[PDB]
Enzyme design. Structure first.
Site, short mmCIF file in Angstrom:
data_model
loop_
_atom_site.label_atom_id
_atom_site.label_comp_id
_atom_site.label_asym_id
_atom_site.label_seq_id
_atom_site.Cartn_x
_atom_site.Cartn_y
_atom_site.Cartn_z
CG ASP A 150 -2.00 0.99 1.23
OD1 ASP A 150 -1.97 1.86 0.40
OD2 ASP A 150 -2.83 0.91 2.07
CB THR A 151 2.12 3.49 -2.70
OG1 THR A 151 0.89 3.61 -3.40
CG2 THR A 151 2.98 2.43 -3.38
N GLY A 152 -0.18 4.26 -0.25
CA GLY A 152 -0.93 5.31 0.45
C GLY A 152 -0.86 5.16 1.96
C1 LIG Z 1 -6.55 6.91 3.35
C2 LIG Z 1 -5.09 6.73 3.01
C3 LIG Z 1 -4.40 8.07 3.11
C4 LIG Z 1 -4.34 5.85 4.03
N1 LIG Z 1 -4.89 4.55 4.09
C5 LIG Z 1 -4.18 3.65 3.21
C6 LIG Z 1 -5.08 3.37 2.00
O1 LIG Z 1 -4.26 2.73 1.08
C7 LIG Z 1 -6.30 2.50 2.46
C8 LIG Z 1 -5.89 1.03 2.70
C9 LIG Z 1 -6.99 0.29 3.05
C10 LIG Z 1 -7.48 -0.67 2.18
C11 LIG Z 1 -8.60 -1.42 2.49
C12 LIG Z 1 -9.23 -1.25 3.71
C13 LIG Z 1 -8.73 -0.32 4.60
F1 LIG Z 1 -9.40 -0.20 5.79
C14 LIG Z 1 -7.61 0.46 4.28
N2 LIG Z 1 -7.38 2.43 1.51
C15 LIG Z 1 -8.62 2.93 1.55
O2 LIG Z 1 -9.04 3.65 2.41
O3 LIG Z 1 -9.42 2.58 0.48
C16 LIG Z 1 -10.79 2.43 0.65
C17 LIG Z 1 -11.49 3.28 -0.36
C18 LIG Z 1 -10.79 3.23 -1.72
O4 LIG Z 1 -11.52 2.48 -2.68
C19 LIG Z 1 -11.74 1.20 -2.11
O5 LIG Z 1 -10.43 0.51 -1.89
C20 LIG Z 1 -10.23 0.26 -0.54
C21 LIG Z 1 -11.27 1.02 0.23
C22 LIG Z 1 -12.42 1.26 -0.77
C23 LIG Z 1 -12.86 2.63 -0.43
S1 LIG Z 1 -5.09 3.98 5.68
O6 LIG Z 1 -6.16 4.70 6.28
O7 LIG Z 1 -5.43 2.50 5.58
C24 LIG Z 1 -3.66 4.11 6.47
C25 LIG Z 1 -2.76 3.05 6.40
C26 LIG Z 1 -1.56 3.18 7.05
C27 LIG Z 1 -1.32 4.26 7.74
N3 LIG Z 1 -0.25 4.63 8.41
C28 LIG Z 1 -0.51 5.81 8.94
N4 LIG Z 1 0.36 6.45 9.71
C29 LIG Z 1 0.07 7.78 10.22
C30 LIG Z 1 0.58 7.87 11.63
C31 LIG Z 1 0.72 8.88 9.35
O8 LIG Z 1 -1.63 6.23 8.63
C32 LIG Z 1 -2.21 5.25 7.84
C33 LIG Z 1 -3.37 5.22 7.22
#
Ligand SMILES: CC(C)CN(C[C@@H](O)[C@H](Cc1cccc(F)c1)NC(=O)O[C@H]1[C@H]2CO[C@H]3OC[C@@H]1[C@H]3C2)S(=O)(=O)c1ccc2nc(NC(C)C)oc2c1
Lengths: 99, 99
Positions: free
Chosen positions: A25-27
């Site tokens: 996950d690059t995000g």
């Molecule tokens: C929103 C984004 C900026 C960051 N997110 C990573 C993103 O890739 C995240 C990974 C993911 C995938 C499936 C289910 C999840 F619960 C989480 N993806 C995400 O929100 O995508 C959602 C939305 C995108 O389209 C579809 O694909 C997956 C679902 C669905 C709706 S995160 O919320 O999961 C995340 C992960 C690791 C992190 N590390 C941190 N560290 C902080 C202290 C800076 O914050 C994080 C935040």
């Protein structure tokens, strides 16, 4: 390997003697794994995402084998819907985006 | 370009006549942008992430220029904390992971 993105980029990981699948996950800045049994000390942390915030356990200097590459770093354990490999570990296995 | 992951993989996008920054996100199936003004019809959708679920507006056949590459597809607009370019658009610009 090179991985195209027509499907979710899932890989096999080995962590704390257990085999799991996780999403490259690059995000994700950090690595977040679903509830699992890890040994040793941990610190409470709260991380935010699309729908709000979760409480996680922070484990430091954790060994993880990601698609047959070894890395050591911080792993967060808590109620994430899916196992996420974030940039803290993707940089250690030499992972890049290309277009 | 090739992009390493020591920093967040942010790129410039142009969408609905507006310039924005967005994160190239391999962990996102779909593209989710912060509240912005887009023209035309849209359908209610709920998407889930780390801390729960958000309501978004689904816009289809939306033109987006991502780091100078044109793509057309679905864009979700709603309370995401950051603009996310998901795999629905990353596949159109030929984006791959490599390690
Ligand atoms: C929103 C984004 C900026 C960051 N997110 C990573 C993103 O890739 C995240 C990974 C993911 C995938 C499936 C289910 C999840 F619960 C989480 N993806 C995400 O929100 O995508 C959602 C939305 C995108 O389209 C579809 O694909 C997956 C679902 C669905 C709706 S995160 O919320 O999961 C995340 C992960 C690791 C992190 N590390 C941190 N560290 C902080 C202290 C800076 O914050 C994080 C935040």
């Amino acid at each position: 390997p090179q991985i195209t993105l027509w499907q979710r980029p899932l890989v096999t990981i080995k962590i704390g003697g257990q085999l799991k699948e996780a999403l490259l996950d690059t995000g994700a800045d950090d690595t977040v794994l679903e509830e699992m049994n890890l040994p040793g000390r941990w610190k409470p942390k709260m991380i935010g995402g699309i729908g709000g915030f979760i409480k996680v356990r922070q484990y430091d200097q954790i060994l993880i084998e990601i698609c047959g590459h070894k890395a050591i770093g911080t792993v967060l354990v808590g109620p994430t819907p899916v196992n996420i490999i974030g940039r803290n570990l993707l940089t250690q296995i030499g992972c890049t985006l290309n277009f």
